[PDB]
Write a structure and sequence with these properties.
The protein has one helix spanning about 5-10, and strands at about 15-20, 25-30, 35-40, 45, 55-60, 65-70, 75-80, 85-90, 100, 105-110, 120-125, 130, 135-140, 150-155, 160-165, 170-175, 185, 195, 200-205, 210-215, 220-225, 235-240, 245-250, 255-260, 265-270, 275-280, 285-290, 295-300. By secondary structure, it is mainly beta. The protein has one domain. The protein starts with a helix and ends with a strand. It comes from Homo sapiens.
Length: about 300
């Protein structure tokens, strides 16, 4: 019995929670007590790790919400809206909801840059935007994707560096200091998820039945193509250590891979097609969101 099977099996019986809408995103706060934000339908639910009911709700109380993502200090949530808005929610519940307008279609991807005071958005208008929070305005637009921009990752370390994935089958790497993408890689299926490793030198792309790992320092050299899912790969996650990659799929499985070998070291089965996957600090909680509106929460033994 491998040390990996021992590690990833070391969870209690799952707790199933009904969200009564497809769970499009789950994100853990990086700050104690590591609450998680659940995006479904037109609102964001906050749960405590052991909550079976939401402890807070954030919403415009309008249209479908997308991609609710904590800032690195756990103090703001950024989200997109169906009507083409980017929203910031103050987690304290003290300050008014802030709205950035400019996108002309649904915004499915938002992230904070490393500096914490800029946002990267991607929309169904095919465009990528860089927003200055303090100046309350767009500073850059990139019109290089030719189809919906459905996923995105700002560098953990570099405030200038960020990536987006598109249904145009490409991932584009952008530097805030230049007006055109620095690199483009052909995932070759519609891109549903991306990950940038902290160095910026390795990028993971997921979509169709494929997970692909790219060396971006080497001009976007393909390191490996993984075909371990039977249906669309919908989500990517790193383990707390950065030493494991997790993928979730409409095929109801989460695969865990070594970041050294890219061999599968564990497999988990879920009741329904997976849309979202999130791991708490030191992997103490694993949350999977599915198409039938149910969250599966696993607590570490």
């Amino acid at each position: 019995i491998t040390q990996d099977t021992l590690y990833w099996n070391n969870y209690k019986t799952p707790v199933q929670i009904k969200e009564f809408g497809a769970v499009s995103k789950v994100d853990f706060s990086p700050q104690p007590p590591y609450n998680y934000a659940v995006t479904a339908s037109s609102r964001i639910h906050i749960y405590g790790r052991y909550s079976q009911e939401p402890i807070k709700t954030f919403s415009r109380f309008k249209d479908t919400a997308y991609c609710a993502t904590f800032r690195q200090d756990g103090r703001l949530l950024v989200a997109g809206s169906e009507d083409g808005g980017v929203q910031l929610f103050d987690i304290s519940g003290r300050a008014p909801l802030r709205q950035f307008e400019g996108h002309t279609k649904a915004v499915h991807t938002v992230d904070f840059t490393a500096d914490k005071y800029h946002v990267v958005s991607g929309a169904d208008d095919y465009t990528v935007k860089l927003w200055d929070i303090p100046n309350s305005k767009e500073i850059l637009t990139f019109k290089e994707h030719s189809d919906y921009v459905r996923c995105g990752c700002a560098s953990k370390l570099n405030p200038d560096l960020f990536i987006t994935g598109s249904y145009d089958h490409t991932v584009k790497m952008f530097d805030a200091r230049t007006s055109e993408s620095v690199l483009s890689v052909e995932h070759g299926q519609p891109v549903e998820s991306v990950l940038l490793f902290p160095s910026g030198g390795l990028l993971v792309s997921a979509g169709g039945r494929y997970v692909k790992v790219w060396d971006m320092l080497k001009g976007g050299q393909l390191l490996v193509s993984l075909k371990n899912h039977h249906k669309t790969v919908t989500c990517l996650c790193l383990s707390s250590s950065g030493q494991r990659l997790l993928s979730g799929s409409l095929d109801r499985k989460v695969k865990v891979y070594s970041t050294t070998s890219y061999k599968v070291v564990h497999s988990f089965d879920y009741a329904a097609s997976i849309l979202s996957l999130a791991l708490a600090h030191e992997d103490e909680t694993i949350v999977v969101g599915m198409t039938n509106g149910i969250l599966s929460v696993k607590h570490r033994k």
